[PDB]
């Protein structure tokens, strides 16, 4: 019955269910980022040589560079039978608020985590901005999540790569003391009550245990049928559907503006509620957030289910044994090289008694003298001189160094190419586009295009707050994957160039050349060229 108890029971179930994959992913990230001698016991004691002759890291670097050379971003496209300009405004808004460094950095972090461990993630958040708002004095931005395996915990009863069927998700936020003070100030919490939350609970090193503060955010999705009011727009048309929950502080002002209620339907849809929690208490209970979907986007590498148990793998998991064997063999060889007596002769003391300064290594003598006789034995026994054998690397050591290196090289071949990883990133970006479309419909100001112009229908309440008015004809565009562009002008330039690349030297080629000059940036000479293109196109009609 207790809300905290139910939340903790669900979180504990998911935490214990996703355990083995989380530990293996943490081990892979540690192995590829910190050190390959993941031993918690030999961090003290009498020391022995332990080298790090890395052979997997160049492969990870090459794969990361290969996947960075091919950026991917969301592309909104019109649906079937809808207006051909049904995605221009949405695409412009997306390119507006996703051109910042934060989105690119978050995507790159998630990509690197996906290659190394096997799972990465990022988040979509909405913030208030006044200097440069995208729409309705708000911005939608993308934030990174580090160590998604141990920081983002999904519903256990999820059978999809993008976790769109999951109904709740726990995200553990870690922040320093100053960060916790900022968090408390922003969310109206109490600074004196320091929170805490479950941790990965590992052994590996005494360090990396930064003195931090953990809090949890629990996102849950509820699908329900809610009352929706059908209105009559007094400027165009009539059938216009609004949600009662959204239209609740301007319900009286709608009639004053000129809207007349026609009917009242019940429409099924989803809402997302966020809770800020610790283990011992709940700080914020059910703060409703914008959108229909959980704002966390996961990216996976080699992902699947073995026995109703999720497994995700990167590129480093299978090279670990060979790399560790190679490091061990190299350390053994270095020990052999140093702590071994060199090649030197074996002498009885009587043989070189009195000539001990001839063998110290100087070159002042043309030969080496030896004692011949003894006063008791008459003559010293004759035995051929022996020399300590030179140090040698064992054939087993050499053979296994070769075999381990070859095994690591053979097994560290993702694909033939990173096509599967890029397709998984494309799936993640499609999910991101769906989430962003939901948030835009919920909070932004989407103008409807009439064929009679963009008609922005809005109203304000008595508290000087403006409430958005979005009709139910909002899902006119679907999501796809295309090249990453910083602006719609850049996208238009790319499309014009692609068309020019296939159009032969006819009259459409001249048309496209003039259009390319149209879509150019501004200096002075290119300004003159753009003016010439404008005049030519208008003259040709």
């Amino acid at each position: 019955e207790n809300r905290l108890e139910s939340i903790l029971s669900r979180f504990d179930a998911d935490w214990t269910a996703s355990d083995e994959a989380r530990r293996e992913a943490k081990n892979d990230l540690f192995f590829s980022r910190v050190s390959q001698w993941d031993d918690w016991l030999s961090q003290y004691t009498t020391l022995q040589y332990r080298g790090q002759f890395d052979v997997v890291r160049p492969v990870v670097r090459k794969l990361v560079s290969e996947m960075r050379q091919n950026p991917i971003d969301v592309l909104y496209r019109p649906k079937d039978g809808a207006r051909p300009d049904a995605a221009d405004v949405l695409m412009g808004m997306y390119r507006t608020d996703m051109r910042h460094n934060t989105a690119k950095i978050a995507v790159n972090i998630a990509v690197r985590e996906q290659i190394e461990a096997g799972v990465g993630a990022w988040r979509l958040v909405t913030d208030y901005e006044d200097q440069s708002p995208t729409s309705n004095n708000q911005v939608i931005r993308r934030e990174p999540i580090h160590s998604a395996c141990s920081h983002v915990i999904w519903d256990s009863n999820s059978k999809l790569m993008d976790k769109s069927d999951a109904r709740h998700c726990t995200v553990i936020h870690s922040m320093s003391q100053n960060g916790w003070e900022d968090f408390a100030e922003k969310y109206d919490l109490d600074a004196d009550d320091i929170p805490s939350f479950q941790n990965p609970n590992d052994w590996v090193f005494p360090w990396l245990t930064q003195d931090t503060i953990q809090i949890a955010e629990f996102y849950e999705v509820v699908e329900k049928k809610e009352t929706a009011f059908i209105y009559q727009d007094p400027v165009t048309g009539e059938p216009v559907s609004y949600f009662k929950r959204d239209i609740k502080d301007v319900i009286d002002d709608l009639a004053d503006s000129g809207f007349i209620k026609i009917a009242e339907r019940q429409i099924k849809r989803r809402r997302v509620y966020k809770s800020i929690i610790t283990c011992t208490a709940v700080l914020k209970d059910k703060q409703l957030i914008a959108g229909e979907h959980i704002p966390i986007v996961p990216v996976f590498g080699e992902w699947g289910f073995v026995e109703d148990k999720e497994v995700y793998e990167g590129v480093v998991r299978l090279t670990k044994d060979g790399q560790r064997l190679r490091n061990m063999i190299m350390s053994f060889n270095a020990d052999i090289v140093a702590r071994t007596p060199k090649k030197k002769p074996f002498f009885w003391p009587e043989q070189i008694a009195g000539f001990e300064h001839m063998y110290d290594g100087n070159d002042d003598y043309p030969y080496y003298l030896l004692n011949r006789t003894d006063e008791n034995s008459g003559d010293l026994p004759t035995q051929p001189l022996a020399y300590y054998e030179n140090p040698e690397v064992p054939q087993a050591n050499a053979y296994m160094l070769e075999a381990a290196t070859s095994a690591v090289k053979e097994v560290a071949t993702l694909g033939v190419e990173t096509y599967v990883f890029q397709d998984n990133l494309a799936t993640a970006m499609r999910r991101d586009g769906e989430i962003y479309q939901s948030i835009v419909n919920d909070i932004y100001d989407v103008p409807r295009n009439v064929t009679i112009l963009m008609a922005e229908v809005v109203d304000l309440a008595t508290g000087e707050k403006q409430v958005l008015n979005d009709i139910r004809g909002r899902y006119e565009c679907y999501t796809d994957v295309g090249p990453s562009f910083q602006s719609m002008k850049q996208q238009n330039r790319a499309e014009i160039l692609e068309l020019l690349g296939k159009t032969p030297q006819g009259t459409p080629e001249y048309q496209l050349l003039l259009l390319q000059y149209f879509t150019l940036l501004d200096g002075k000479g290119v300004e003159m060229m753009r003016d010439y293109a404008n005049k030519q196109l208008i003259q040709m009609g």
Binding site: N2, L41, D193, S196, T209, T280
Partner: protein, 421 residues
């Protein structure tokens, strides 16, 4: 030797009391200097005078308080050998069992504290399964004693049966020779009802203590005594030190056979209506908290007398007992026979203070400390691991620092069936 990974799960315990108890996390920075003790005020009661001429009769203001503190960590220290295989096979399951055992220990502390500092005592001369609706009568006696004393129950009330008495209640329900809805529920399942006789949460608890009988007999109060409500008092140096309101040290003829947990009632003292100050028909019941010395004990409800002439009017506003002790008042013990206690309370009577153990500091190098969220009971501990080669092993320690507190012992109760002989 063939072996598998299949686990034969053997135990599954429930922790309702610890779940329902409120958990408090006061600031550790201040608690470090405050000696782990924090004081909270009590709802204020005002006196009343009727008349016209009230010259030189203006009283003062008095606000009493209680103090809550904590105990010591409840760890799960264990050493783990690296070379052995039966240790690598068992390490993670050991961690899980440690979490479960820590939750169970917290629940046990809650149950024992509730059953040992419960002022209100309901007793029966025979077993619950004796007469029809006797379980209902047992619950209704508790609800009535909470109602007559005018105790605040805004957060809610709770009643915990022991499994034997819960079974007896179910048997009484199902032997009704009829089947409505409650009898059919009590037949198909063992549950009697979720709410009974006014309580809004009636459960069963496998971890309720057994109150062993007290051998004490023939004890009388030695010396007329008066207990006065007060907030602070002067120490040797003249500094004012605060006073807890939930304790009172009485002097008896001899405290032999008494322990922490027994229930006593003097012959003559009667409960009052708290706010209205009307004499009840029920004997005042106290729980002996600590047996100090040999002729003194410490009872949890402070017996403030309505007829005490040494009390200022503001102090007398807090009176909860109709009379004082008069140097011969025989004290009757109420637990004259062993019985597994049923425990009822108001939901805001037991709290669980908790504190962090900051072992993540830069001071503790060479060992790794992380957090550890206990399931069931919603608490935090630390999980610390260190290595060693003097024995070629590793030490793992799951620490948890908390403390159960009974802020309103007059709200908690104890049910004792079959207190005959």
């Amino acid at each position: 030797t063939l072996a598998v990974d299949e686990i034969i799960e053997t135990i599954s315990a429930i922790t309702p009391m610890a779940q329902k108890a409120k958990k408090y996390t006061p600031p550790a920075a201040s608690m470090q200097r405050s000696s782990n003790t924090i004081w909270m005020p009590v709802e204020q009661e005002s006196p009343t005078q009727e008349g016209w001429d009230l010259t030189d009769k203006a009283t003062g203001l008095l606000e009493l308080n209680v103090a809550v503190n904590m105990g010591e960590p409840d760890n799960d220290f264990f050493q783990l050998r690296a070379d052995d295989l039966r240790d690598e096979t068992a390490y993670r399951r050991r961690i899980q069992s440690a979490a479960r055992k820590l939750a169970n220990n917290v629940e046990l502390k809650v149950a024992n504290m509730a059953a040992e500092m419960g002022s209100l005592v309901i007793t029966s001369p025979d077993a619950i399964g004796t007469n029809t609706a006797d379980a209902w009568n047992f619950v209704a006696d508790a609800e009535e004693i909470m109602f007559s004393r005018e105790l605040n129950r805004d957060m809610g009330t709770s009643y915990f049966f022991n499994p034997q008495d819960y079974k007896k209640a179910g048997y009484d329900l199902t032997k009704r020779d009829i089947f409505g809805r409650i009898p059919e529920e009590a037949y198909r399942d063992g549950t009697i009802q979720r709410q009974v006789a006014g309580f809004d949460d009636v459960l069963r608890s496998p971890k309720l203590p057994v109150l062993t009988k007290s051998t004490a007999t023939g004890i009388t109060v030695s010396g007329a005594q008066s207990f006065k409500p007060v907030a602070w008092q002067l120490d040797n140096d003249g500094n004012k030190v605060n006073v807890d309101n939930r304790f009172a040290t009485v002097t008896l003829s001899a405290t032999t056979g008494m322990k922490r947990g027994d229930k006593i009632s003097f012959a003559g003292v009667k409960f009052l209506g708290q706010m209205a100050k009307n004499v009840l028909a029920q004997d005042a019941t106290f729980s002996v908290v600590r047996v100090v010395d040999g002729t003194h004990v410490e009872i949890t409800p402070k017996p403030v007398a309505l007829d005490d002439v040494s009390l200022s009017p503001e102090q007398r506003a807090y009176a909860n007992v109709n009379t004082s002790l008069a140097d011969a008042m025989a004290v009757n013990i109420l637990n004259v026979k062993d019985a597994r206690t049923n425990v009822f309370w108001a939901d805001d009577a037991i709290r669980i203070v908790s504190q962090p153990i900051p072992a993540n500091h830069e001071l503790f190098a060479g060992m790794k400390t992380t957090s550890f969220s206990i399931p069931d009971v919603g608490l935090n501990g630390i999980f610390a691991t260190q290595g060693d080669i003097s024995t070629l092993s590793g030490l793992c320690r799951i620490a948890l620092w908390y403390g159960v507190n009974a802020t309103r012992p007059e709200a908690i109760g104890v049910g004792l069936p079959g207190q005959t002989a």
